[PDB]
């Protein structure tokens with residue numbers, strides 16, 4: 050079956066039906082919002098129902114619109130053109146007072162990303178919202194048109210980032226250190242399997258420690274760090290751990306060790322959901338970590354609202370240094386991108402409420 054999502058206006062005059070809650074962005078193109086509006090003909094006689102798509106960034110206090118489009122759904126515009134199969138089947142299944150609408154995304158918009166601060170975080174809440182709003186318009190006096198709220202339905206859809214057709218090079222990084230009073234160096238080489246991983250896919254961090262010093266590498270710790278840059282209004286910055294694995298081995302003096310740890314960055318593994326960039330509201334079940342921001346060529350990054358990136362951090366705890374030979378500890382970073390899997394190149398309908406489930 051195909052679950053159709055609906056939402057009824059307060060006066061029950063305009064009901065909206067979408068085929069999805071989350072619409073797919075896979076770099077090359079963005080999935081369009083096709084849907085239908087069921088109109089109570091007696092409550093709308095003399096009115097005009099439109100449907101609009103608005104993407105906007107919010108901080109707080111401050112707001113900046115990023116994209117706006119609007120389409121007339123009633124009265125029917127031109128030829129009754131059922132553009133998509135979903136629209137035609139929803140009209141055949143749903144009645145005669147059903148009229149279709151199509152709203153298309155551009156390529157210069159971000160994906161659904163929003164964050165609510167933590168106790169120690171200085172910044173305020175912010176996010177990027179995509180709102181599908183259907184509404185009716187009538188005219189009592191000849192001097193103005195009015196838009197009542199009760200004749201409107203408001204939906205908050207997602208623009209979800211899915212993997213593109215191609216992928217980047219293999220992520221690698223090398224680092225070296227010669228501590229004070231030591232002629233022999235400590236070397237660290239980190240490699241990932243691929244450049245793009247999916248939400249829930251295991252990330253195998255391959256660590257190669259070549260220790261030529263007199264000192265023992267007490268600990269090897271691998272982290273998945275999320276870097277979040279707010280690029281509108283205030284230049285807030287967050288760097289938080291979303292996955293951690295501590296290696297069981299030590300590296301004795303004048304020896305090498307190559308081990309592959311496995312980390313899985315998931316929002317489900319963070320009891321604290323504040324201070325990190327998410328793709329939805331915190332209280333919602335289907336909320337995940339924000340996917341890696343993909344800035345397209347030529348588009349100024351400020352329009353993206355919130356920039357989200359991911360990196361592996363390998364931290365080495367070395368003996369004989371803490372407190373007498375160094376004041377900073379050794380680590381290195383390996384960037385990668387995180388997003389959702391790649392898209393795959395007379396229907397039966399069951400209708401549910403649009404409201405996302407809680408937890």
Ligand SMILES: O=P(O)(O)O[C@H]1[C@H](OP(=O)(O)O)[C@@H](OP(=O)(O)O)[C@H](OP(=O)(O)O)[C@@H](OP(=O)(O)O)[C@H]1OP(=O)(O)O
Nearest residue numbers: 056178201202203204205330332333402403404405406407
């Ligand atoms: O302030 P309102 O006009 O009453 O809007 C609310 C509010 O949405 P916003 O805060 O984004 O404006 C709810 O969110 P909460 O503040 O309660 O967390 C939301 O409920 P959801 O959390 O499920 O989004 C609800 O929408 P809905 O009725 O679908 O649950 C929506 O009400 P409206 O339908 O009037 O927009």
